[PDB]
């Protein structure tokens, strides 16, 4: 539990941009294995992650450091590449979102404080 | 060239740590599909990437911005998750190397 300037940047600049992205919709809430017909999803992906959870964690001061939050973004993208087929559209959507994420992390203010 | 603080950091901190890491050896050179019995590899992965390529690029000032080196690290790790079976050891190795990549990139100086 902290507020830092890098966490505020991950919340208000990085997450805000990804959330609104036209490819974001499959990532805004936990993967619903039942709705989507994916009875194997929880057998392959042991640490489900989604932007909903990351956003809420940011609002409830769950993270102590930015890096912890960046790690959750990474798990979410990684789950998607691991579980889905190479040819599924969701893989392209994840890769596009993940490039923005890396671009925006590159401009994160670097006085790590609060 | 002068090398921006960011590419300096990617070279002297990020690549420094990954290059010598005990999980690094499968990533140090381009995936050799013939050596590894992997006739489908280039069918699935259209942009192969590896640490040798990125290390050489950082050494020869091939890069204009950090974000472009960072993308190459990302492609390398993503290739690996996309091609390989979830249960493969290589997947666990890549996940460990990628966490270090992100930890370090959390402390990369500002641009400019």
């Amino acid at each position: 539990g902290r507020v830092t300037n890098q966490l505020q940047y991950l919340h208000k600049v990085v997450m805000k941009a990804l959330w609104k992205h036209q490819f974001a919709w499959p990532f805004r809430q936990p993967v619903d294995a039942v709705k989507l017909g994916l009875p194997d999803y929880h057998k392959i992906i042991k640490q489900p992650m989604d932007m909903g959870t990351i956003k809420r964690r940011l609002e409830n001061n769950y993270y102590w450091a930015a890096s912890e939050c960046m790690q959750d973004f990474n798990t979410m993208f990684t789950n998607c590449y691991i579980y889905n087929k190479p040819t599924d559209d969701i893989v392209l959507m994840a890769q596009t979102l993940e490039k923005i994420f890396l671009q925006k992390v590159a401009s994160m203010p670097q006085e790590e404080q609060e | 060239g002068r090398v921006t603080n960011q590419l300096q950091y990617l070279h002297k901190v990020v690549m420094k740590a990954l290059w010598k890491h005990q999980f690094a050896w499968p990533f140090r050179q381009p995936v050799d599909a013939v050596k590894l019995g992997l006739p489908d590899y280039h069918k699935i992965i259209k942009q192969p990437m590896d640490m040798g390529t990125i290390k050489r690029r950082l050494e020869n000032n091939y890069y204009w911005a950090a974000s472009e080196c960072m993308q190459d690290f990302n492609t390398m790790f993503t290739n690996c998750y996309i091609y390989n079976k979830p249960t493969d050891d290589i997947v666990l190795m890549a996940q460990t190397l990628e966490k270090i990549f992100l930890q370090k990139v959390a402390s990369m100086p500002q641009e400019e």
Binding site: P26, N84, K85, D88 | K85, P86
Partner: peptide, 8 residues
């Protein structure tokens, strides 16, 4: 080893 979300 996957089952996936749909291909294209």
């Amino acid at each position: 080893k996957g089952l996936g979300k749909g291909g294209a």
